[PDB]
Amino acid sequence: VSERHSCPLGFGHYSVVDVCIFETVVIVLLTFLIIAGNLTVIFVFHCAPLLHHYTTSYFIQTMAYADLFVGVSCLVPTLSLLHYSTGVHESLTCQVFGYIISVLKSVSMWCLACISVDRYLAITKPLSYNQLVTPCRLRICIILIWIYSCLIFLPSFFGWGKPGYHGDIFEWCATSWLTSAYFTGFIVCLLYAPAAFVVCFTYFHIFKICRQHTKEAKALIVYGSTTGNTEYTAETIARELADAGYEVDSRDAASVEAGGLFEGFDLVLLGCSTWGDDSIELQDDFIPLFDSLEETGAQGRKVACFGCGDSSWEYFCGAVDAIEEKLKNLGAEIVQDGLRIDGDPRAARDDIVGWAHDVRGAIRRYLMVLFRITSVFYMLQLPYIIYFLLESSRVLDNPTLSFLTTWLAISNSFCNPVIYALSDSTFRLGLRRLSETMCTS
Ligand SMILES: Cc1nn(-c2cccc3cc(Cc4cccc(C(F)(F)F)c4)sc23)c(CO)c1C(=O)NCCO
Ligand SMILES: Cc1cc2nc3c(=O)[nH]c(=O)nc-3n(C[C@H](O)[C@H](O)[C@H](O)COP(=O)(O)O)c2cc1C
Ligand SMILES: CCCCCCCC/C=C\CCCCCCCC(=O)OC[C@H](O)CO
Ligand SMILES: CCCCCCCC/C=C\CCCCCCCC(=O)OC[C@H](O)CO
Ligand SMILES: CCCCCCCC/C=C\CCCCCCCC(=O)OC[C@H](O)CO
To answer: What sections of the protein cross the membrane?
Structure first.
C-alpha cells in the first residue's frame, strides 16, 4: 500500500497520497489561458457583431466552446489534486475525466474537417453554397460531431483499455490502467485517420483551384475627393493592383448609384476624405453612397477602406471609421485595417504602396487563417498521437514524454482562439471597440 513512483518532469514522487506539484501547476496555468482565450472569442463574436462567414462561424464557435470546456474540465481535478488526494484509487474519476477530454478534442478535430469542406464548397460552387449550406444543416452537422465523439470513446467504460493519457494525473490511471493496441487501432481508424484525411485531401484540392487565368480578381475602387488627395491615393492604389494583374474599375463617388454597386466584385476598396467645419462629415459626393450602403451588395463582400485627413481634427479620418462601422454592421468582411493618410498623400506614397501590396493577400486571407489554425492544431497533437501509437504497441514507455506530449496537445485549445482573434481585422476591430467600452468600466 502507498508505493511511490517518480514524477514525469524528474523531481518528486507520486503515490495514492503524494501529488506531483510542479506538473499540476503547469496544467493549471495552461487552463487559465485556454479559458481566457476562448471566453474572449465567444464574447467578441456575439457582442461585437461578427457577421461575415456566418456559416463557417458555426464551427469556429463550437470549437471555442469545446476548448473552453477542455480548460475547465482540466482545471477542476488539478485544483482538487493541489488541495488534497483521497488516499484511494480514483478508478472511475480518471476514467470519466479521460473520456470527457477525448470527446472534446474529437469535437474540435471534426470541426476543422468540416471547415475545410465548407471552404471547398464556397470556392468551387459559391452560388450553390449560398442556397444549400443552411443553419438547419449546420446544426445537424454539429449534433452528429458531438454524438459520434461520445460513441467512439464509449468502449473505455466496457473493458477495451485506456483511450489516452489525459487521466494519468490520477495515480490509478497512470499505473494500473493500460492502453490496448486494438482500442488505439479503433480510435485511429474512427477518428485520427479519417479527420486528418478529410483536411489533407480537401486543402490539397483548395490549393490547386484556379477559376480566373486572365486576371487575379476584379476590384472596384470608389472614392470621394474634394481637393484631389483621396483621388491621388485611389489612383496610386489602382495602379499597384493593375500591375499585379487585377481588373481594376476606379470610379468617382459623384458618378455612381448605390443599387447593386458592389455586385460582381471580389474586392471593393472605399476611399473617402473627412470634411465638416464643426462635425465629422463625409466628403460630399460620398454621403449619398453611405446613406444607401445597405443597397450596394455589401453582405459577405470583401472590403477595405482608405482616406485622407489631418490629425489636428478629433475625428482623424473619421469618414473611414464611419464607413468601416456601417460595412461591419451590414456583414461585410473587413479584409484589412483601413489606410488613414495624415497630410499630403504624395509624401506618404510608400505607406499607400505598402497597403496596396497587403490588400493583394485580402481575397485568400480568411481561407489562409483557417488553414493555419488547422495546421497548428495537428502539429501540436502529432507528438501525442505518435506517443499513443508507440506506447499502445509497447515500443516505448516514457512518462516524461507522456506528460509533455499530452500538455502540448491540450495547448491547441489556446492556439485556435489566439490565431483566429489576431488574424481577423473585423475581429480585432470588434475586440478593440468592445474593449474600449470595457476599459472605462
Ligand atoms: C500531476 C501528475 N501527473 N502525473 C503523471 C505522471 C506520469 C505521466 C503523466 C502523463 C500525464 C498526462 C497529462 C499531462 C498534462 C495535462 C494533462 C491533463 F489532461 F490533465 F490536463 C494530462 S499526467 C502524468 C501524475 C501521476 O498520476 C500526477 C500526480 O500528481 N499523481 C498523484 C495524484 O493522482
Ligand atoms: C473644412 C474642412 C474640414 C475638415 N475636417 C476634417 C476632419 O474632421 N478630420 C480629418 O481627419 N480631416 C479633416 N480635414 C482635412 C481633409 O480631410 C484633408 O485635407 C484631405 O486631404 C482632403 O482630401 P480630399 O482632397 O480627397 O477631399 C478637413 C479639411 C477641411 C478643409
Ligand atoms: C507552441 C504552443 C504552446 C502553447 C502556448 C502556451 C504558453 C505557455 C505559457 C505558460 C504555461 C506554463 C509554463 C510553465 C513554466 C513556469 C513554471 C512555474 O512557474 O512553476 C513554479 C511552481 O511554483 C513550482 O512549484
Ligand atoms: C514521441 C514524440 C515524438 C515526436 C517528436 C517530433 C515532433 C513532431 C511535431 C512537429 C514536427 C513538425 C515541425 C515543423 C512544422 C512544419 C511542418 C508544416 O507545417 O508543413 C506544411 C507547410 O505549411 C507547407 O507545406
Ligand atoms: C514534446 C516532444 C518534443 C518535440 C520536438 C522538440 C522541439 C524543440 C523545442 C523546444 C524544446 C522543448 C522541450 C523538449 C522536450 C524534451 C523531450 C524529452 O524530455 O525526452 C527526452 C528525455 O531527455 C528522455 O526522456
So the answer is: 25-45, 68-88, 97-117, 140-160, 184-204, 369-389, 400-420
Q: Among 329, 359, 389, identify where a domain stops.
A: 359
Mapped onto helix, strand or coil, the DSSP state of residue 413 is helix
Atom of ligand 2 at shortest range from CA of 344: 21
Facing residues of 272 across strands? 224
Taking the centre of ligand 3 as the mean of its atom positions, its distance from the CA of residue 357, in whole angstroms, is: 38
Based on the fold, state whether residues 39 and 136 are members of the same structural domain. yes
Give the ligand with the smallest distance to the CA of 346.
2
> Domain of 57?
5-209+368-440
Q: Which residues, listed in sequence order, are joined to residue 220 by a DSSP beta bridge?
A: 249, 268
In angstroms, the CA 268 to CA 238 distance is 11
Distance CA 149, CA 153 (A): 7
Structure-determination approach? X-ray
Look up residue 425 and give its three cell numbers: 481585422
- Ligand 2 centre to CA of 351 (Å) is 19
Q: How many domains does the chain have?
A: 2
Which ligand lies nearest the alpha carbon of 8? 1
Residue 426 has which C-alpha cell?
473585423
C-beta neighbour count of 441 within 10 angstroms: 4
